[model samples]
Target: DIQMTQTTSSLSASLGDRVTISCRASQDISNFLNWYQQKPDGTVKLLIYYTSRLHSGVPSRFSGSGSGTDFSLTISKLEQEDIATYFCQQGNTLPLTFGAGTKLELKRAEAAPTVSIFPPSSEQLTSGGASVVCFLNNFYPKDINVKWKIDGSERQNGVLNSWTDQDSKDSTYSMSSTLTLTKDEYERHNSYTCEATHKTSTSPIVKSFNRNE
Candidate 1:
């Protein structure tokens, strides 16, 4: 089987934003290429064929180009419903292969997670044994991962707030997690870290604060 690869595994953009998706064939497949858009639910629709030709029903906004081993898909102006998974394949030969395709998503409202850390609560602050909290909010999409690390050790189990009802209103989902450490541990300042991972982020959104602050 010939290997097919993509330049990006995922891409994030705004509704009116323009972006390109690239695919490379194992050999010089020339103009023999096909592009398809697949939904999360598995519906597949062709977008391009013969490398540069647009599929009949695909929107004018989506286009393709290139030849030989290199090819590309261009979304001239992203639309509200164009955000989805897309696949690129080479038809120059059999034993077909796909890019597993590139997943496209809308940009988060803030572009990244707005993160912060608070000095625990007032009462606990006085006890000399306080619990610090990592606060993250004003982010989009419910698919987010919040992780805590103390001295580089990964913390398990963080809540990912869910959004329901008016799907349009499902914007930023706010959440917080508290890490309990002894007064001594808190003072040690062993590098407490807050890492948030989101589909719209190429890298995890990270922020941290020391107890001594």
Candidate 2:
């Protein structure tokens, strides 16, 4: 299957702002690209078809363009109801591939999350292995990148990432990630770290747990 790359996995915009999301195919797909918008409720609606043709009932503000391997979907002006994920699909060949949808969110003036890392809790250790937890609190936009590191190297196996949780009062987001390790791996590694990257962050926020500590 030809990979459709959507580099901007998420974007934030203000009401009345113009927004554009782009997709690139691994090979020429001509003008056979289609675009769809998905709401948080999981309802998906086709917005554009055949690259530049607007789907039935789609507003004029929503438009598509480009040919060959490159394409784009543009919203002439962002609206309150435009907060949804947008996807692009190639219909030019067999095994049609879709781009990872781009989440369009309303921009918020919010503070950065407070991050923390904790060593394995008693219950976690009693479960027969060691695990570390990374907690992030009070952030906005929900889209974040988290990395678990062991002895300065990135690790992914045995990691569990939680879905973003929201606070009803202020609408801030919180999330957690847990990294489990084998008994030997826990004993061998001198350090474990959780690194988080958020749109508001100038650099990744890191929290570490040293075995000696």
Candidate 3:
């Protein structure tokens, strides 16, 4: 795995400051790059990488371009509270790595706005059995919701953990859930799913895990 360091101008005079963030690889990574933005609460947003290959369901205003040891991420018109630290990762390797990040703060001349999300993480595990955990991050208020589906039905009584951070104008939230099942329960229930819902303009994100796998 190659270590990447991302550096960017730390000041923004307006919401759309033509932000530029660069990532440098320790070795020639051959174009394997990924970028993310993290809010104060640990909510991360996928930005750009892979020489401009945008992640599925990401905004078009965000883009990346570069090759080999150098890459750049640019956000055309930043939004309110888009103020947060941004990171770059090399997806070409396992145990994905991230940069230290360059925190972007809203200029004093700009107005302060807020955003919000719900839930924290979801998971399930049998006593001494396998468990799965899921969390939502780097999301806007227009994109946030959690659903638990068991067998073919939705569940609502499972444990839900959630939190929000207010220190920054960017409203950030997280949720996680865990489930425990017995040998028989694992076999009978093939899989469980945790899905995040978004507004009509946004795409939904879901993670499913097999109990017996």
Candidate 4:
């Protein structure tokens, strides 16, 4: 795994403050960068980098740019309730890695509430079979859910596991699930979707894929 380290000025900031974060790769990562925002409740949101592109429904204010071993994640026009921690990750390898993170806080004189998210992303696998992984970076609200669906049927019963960084108070969470399927079972499945449901928001986001891809 490529070692990644991130350093920020402090763990606290005020609302509407221009928060900057820098991520350094142990070696050249070839520009396959990804950035995420984590909220207090453990939801991750993708900011920028990688395809130098934004995910389908991400906000326009969030942007990312850089290359090789050095990069940056930037949020322009920060909102009043956008208080949370930010992180950067590399997607150029099989097992992805993330930076320590920078905690966004209310300035010493501000009265706004702070929030955070966990697991910068999600991964799912099965015994000797192809598995699907989902990444949830920088999301808010405690009720957010990430799950895998097979052939229009929910696979919530699949073995679920996760890894998290505990030392950093900013709190980053990650989870993975595993499912076992035979060749016949895999062929019979039509589609797979990684669904994420947000509690604070009414709509749920689903990322779907076909088995033959």
- Which RMSD values do the candidates have, in order? 8.6, 5.9, 15.1, 16.5
Would you give me the overall lDDT of model 1?
Answer: 0.75
The candidates, ranked best first by lDDT, are 2, 1, 3, 4
**Worst 10 contiguous positions by lDDT, candidate 3:** 110-119
Model 3 per-residue lDDT tens digits across residues 31-106: 7788887876779877665768888877887888777788888878887656677788887666677777876654
Q: Which stretches of candidate 3 lie over 4 Å from their true place?
A: 93-95, 109-213
TM-score of 3: 0.47
Off by over 4 Å in 2: 112-137, 141-171, 176-213
- Winner on lDDT between 3 and 4 is 3
Model 1 bad stretches (over 4 Å): 111-213
lDDT by residue (tens digit), candidate 2, 7-38: 99988777799999999999999999999999
Q: Estimate each model's TM-score.
A: 0.59, 0.60, 0.47, 0.47
lDDT by residue (tens digit), candidate 4, 60-81 = 7777777888887666766644
Model 4 Cα shift for residue 107 (angstroms): 1.3
Residues forming the 10-long window of minimal summed lDDT in candidate 4: 110-119
Number of the top-ranking candidate, with lDDT as the measure: 2
Better of 2 and 3 by lDDT: 2
Model 4 scores a C-alpha lDDT of 0.60
